[PDB]
Design a protein around this ligand. Structure first.
Ligand SMILES: OC[C@@H]1[C@@H](O[C@@H]2O[C@H](CO)[C@@H](O)[C@H](O)[C@H]2O)[C@H](O)[C@@H](O)c2nccn21
Ligand SMILES: *[C@@H]1O[C@H](CO)[C@@H](O)[C@H](O)[C@H]1NC(C)=O
Length: 431
């Protein structure tokens, strides 16, 4: 895609902190940038749309390469169009803004580079307010193995780069991404919604879901892929689980793991109020070259340090962190194939983490499964009483996009106090 000039692109500021054991925490002047899929796409020589609603202009975009040459991504009115605002340290992502639904942004080191986080033997910490984020919604904070420049160096067809949020990929190998590898994904374009469609290509990469949640339920989930970095896929390579990527991931959702009173409104982690979420990525030898061996989670709310809930499933060790063993036990017990292990487990996830990954923050609803996998029973044809079926208390009728968009359009998530660095250094304790 080309870079458009009709609308100035000003990235909202979102300060983060980098922390070390000896030096404590220091501010970084990071910013956020809207993902390219949400942007206006128009002719380089004017104002004519290359994409309107859910279809491409066949004149400007008769094929992927011609499209990318003819078409520019342009600047965004963050608040006005997409309901994205920042105080400078707190990011608010609103659900529905006019005809726009949801958003995704990436943390930037500067105006043309994503911040590249390397979190092996490190921790990531943030605050979240989900008080206005109900059933059916997902306020997500996660890592994707994108390139810092959004693919600009890799793909001659992409002259827009990170400044315009290009180069997305994740473990779902999404085919609804409009620009991939510097070409518009116009092949066999198929409408899937009023403003969405899919093309013949997907874009795959390893993904660490630090946070996927609403005020009813939350999950953290590593997703390894056999690839290395952002990879365009075709055919069965795009297929979830059987292809390049572990789309299911190895998830830890406290409720799914058999503790139904740990997280939610008025629970130990009280989702009706803001709280702090710490995620630590431990290696076997406590070095940044070691193998990722454990993902720990600690919560802080009202000054109280809250350890992660314990798994309570027959045939699963009662642990409270993600490990390769936990993952094998959980998959066996829930009846899910361990695609996680097949794609290389924590070691592969950690290799991705070590290579550096981009922070994404997003609010979305779910046209495929109504977010039932997050906060309800899933699959909808399995016995709810079976280990792993029940993930939340939301009704199985919840999360229909047309429903939530009508019913709770002003839902929002607020992500704040972003910090990362040495294990045990982004928060402190005392008696
Ligand atoms: O909830 C755990 C997974 C779930 O993956 C989840 O899908 C979501 C939608 O793509 C992703 O955002 C999550 O990161 C992923 O872990 C599968 O979509 C579901 O079919 C299933 N069945 C059993 C497990 N799971
Ligand atoms: C690594 O650190 C953990 C603390 O989280 C400690 O229990 C363990 O003994 C350490 N391992 C080595 C080899 O230093």
């Amino acid at each position: 895609q080309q870079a458009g000039t009709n609308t100035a692109e000003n990235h909202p500021q979102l300060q983060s902190q980098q922390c070390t054991t000896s030096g404590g925490c220091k501010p970084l002047s990071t910013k956020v940038v809207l993902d390219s899929n949400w942007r206006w796409v128009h002719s380089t020589s004017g104002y004519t749309n290359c994409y309107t609603g859910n279809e491409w202009d066949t004149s400007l975009c008769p094929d992927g390469k011609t499209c990318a040459a003819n078409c520019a991504l342009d600047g965004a009115d963050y608040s006005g169009t997409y309901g994205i605002t920042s105080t400078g340290t707190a990011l608010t992502l609103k659900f529905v803004t006019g005809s726009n639904v949801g958003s995704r942004v990436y943390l930037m080191a500067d105006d043309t580079h994503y911040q590249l986080l390397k979190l092996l033997n490190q921790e990531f910490t943030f605050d979240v307010d989900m008080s206005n984020l109900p059933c059916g919604l997902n306020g997500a904070l996660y890592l994707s193995a994108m390139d810092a420049d959004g693919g600009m160096s890799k793909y001659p067809g992409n002259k827009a780069g990170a400044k315009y949020g290009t180069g997305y990929c994740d473990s779902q190998c999404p085919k609804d991404i409009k620009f991939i590898n510097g070409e518009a994904n116009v092949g066999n374009w198929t409408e899937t919604g009023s403003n969405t469609g899919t093309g013949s290509y997907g874009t795959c990469c390893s993904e660490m879901d630090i946070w996927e949640a609403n005020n009813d339920a939350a999950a953290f989930t590593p997703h390894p892929c056999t690839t290395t970095g952002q990879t365009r896929c075709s055919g069965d390579d795009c297929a979830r689980n059987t292809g390049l990527c572990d789309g299911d991931g190895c998830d830890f959702n406290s409720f799914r793991m058999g503790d139904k009173t740990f997280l939610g409104k008025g629970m130990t982690v009280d989702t009706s109020k803001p709280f702090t979420v710490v995620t630590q990525f431990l290696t076997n030898d406590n070095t940044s070259t070691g193998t990722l061996s454990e993902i720990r989670r600690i919560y802080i709310q009202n000054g109280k340090v809250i350890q992660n809930s314990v798994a309570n499933i027959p045939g699963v060790d009662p642990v409270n962190s993600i490990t390769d063993n936990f993952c094998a036990q959980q998959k066996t017990a829930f009846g899910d194939t361990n695609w996680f292990a097949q794609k290389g487990g924590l070691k592969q996830m950690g290799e991705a983490l070590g290579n550096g990954m981009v922070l994404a923050l997003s609010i979305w609803d779910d046209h495929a499964a109504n977010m039932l996998w997050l906060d309800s029973d899933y699959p909808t044809d399995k016995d709810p009483s079976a280990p792993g079926v029940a993930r939340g208390t939301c009704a199985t009728t919840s999360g229909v996009p047309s429903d939530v968009e009508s019913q709770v359009p002003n839902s929002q998530v607020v992500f704040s106090n972003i910090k990362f660095g040495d294990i045990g250094s982004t928060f402190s304790g005392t008696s």
